[PDB]
Symmetry: C2
Subunit: 240 residues, 2 copies
């Protein structure tokens, strides 16, 4: 399909790849040279891609506009940001907002203080569900079918502290469901603890609000600050 | 063509329209029912759209991700946002970031205090180039061909203060170029003044940084704050 070829072209761009030649796009998308050059030209023609004065193609401003305007991602981030900014003022590490997408964590927003701890979460970037405080919080509220899919895959260690045993994960998830937060000491990187709380709309967890902070930092203060922020978000969501 | 039909479907969504029926999409996109369902179903299949439990379709999280990942609009917003938050802390009204796109203003970012003045600028939304502080500041640096296009087209008044006389506009643009700022009292709404300054990169104005504040607030102090923020953004643009 033309739409399938267009999506494969979009998929060649990534969090640290802004500009490509049609030949490189063809190679990354496993598309024949002629097909890659034709599809790229059509995408440039409608403004989904733009061609710079360097002759390389980039994701187009028209694509950005059509994808964000009125979107669930933009509306939630908009409601969330003032509350995320207050957490950032208080904790001065990282505040981020995430959803589940195809059994991975996708980040809608990330606020970072200068010389905060190392953080691998990227806006419009992904991390594993089982290893991420955000992922474990959201997976705790997913159906048994979603939990089974995720729990039945080989589960790599991401950081030193990553829990990979399916039944140990079920115990974590039950505790997180009960407690209304996940602390994840060194589950992504040795130096970092992720802490995540749920964001609810009409009694459904739609997102996770998280902090990333040095491993040795107190957990309880951050948990409380995120809960307060999450309450603010749910209030503001209910009337938006 | 299928790519053309897909773009027309994306175009039926907007800043104020999040969820539609395939029937409503078919009406707005000029597609007969069968074609509207087929294109929407295929876009739902590749995750470009999502179909809710209410049976309504929405812009997809996968589309948001593929459009924003490593995008020019994300990179510039990322560099700008900390400086924009400092301005927002000081002025406590609205701070926003805009570019020119097809001779209209397109907003990349907007920060708002909950008790701020009425503001009609939306992220991934547009305002007229002649009527917004952001548009006038960007059009002052657009070069002669774009300038004459805008000065020769229909120029309606938007708010009470909108300057519509083409020669009075020519003067404003020449003054804006020299002064390095635009104050636009009631050009969009009676209650509000837009104030915009340029963001340069490689000696080219690529964006406008703007505040929207009550008509009665003093302009000079907001100009100074935006100039400082703009220098900060430019330094971090040179360093990246």
């Amino acid at each position: 399909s033309m739409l399938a070829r267009v999506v494969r072209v979009l998929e060649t761009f990534n969090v640290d790849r802004t500009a490509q030649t049609a030949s490189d796009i063809g190679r990354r998308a496993a598309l024949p040279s002629s097909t890659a050059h034709r599809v790229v030209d059509e995408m440039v023609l409608v403004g989904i891609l733009e061609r710079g004065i360097d002759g390389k193609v980039r994701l187009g401003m028209r694509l950005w506009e059509l994808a964000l305007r009125g979107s669930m991602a933009l509306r939630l981030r908009q409601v969330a940001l003032p509350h995320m900014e207050r957490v950032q003022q208080r904790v001065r590490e990282h505040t981020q907002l995430a959803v589940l997408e195809h059994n991975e964590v996708l980040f809608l927003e990330r606020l970072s203080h200068h010389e905060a701890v190392s953080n691998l979460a990227r806006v419009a970037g992904r991390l594993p569900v089982h290893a991420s405080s955000s992922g474990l919080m959201l997976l705790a509220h997913a159906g048994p079918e979603v939990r089974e899919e995720v729990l039945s895959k080989p589960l790599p260690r991401v950081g030193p502290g990553t829990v990979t045993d399916p039944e140990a994960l079920r115990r974590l998830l039950a505790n997180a469901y009960r407690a209304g937060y996940v602390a994840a000491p060194g589950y992504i990187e040795a130096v970092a603890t992720g802490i995540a709380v749920p964001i609810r709309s009409e009694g459904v967890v739609i997102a996770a609000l998280s902090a990333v902070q040095p491993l040795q930092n107190a957990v309880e203060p951050t948990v409380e600050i995120l809960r307060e922020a999450a309450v603010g978000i749910e209030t503001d969501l209910r009337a938006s």
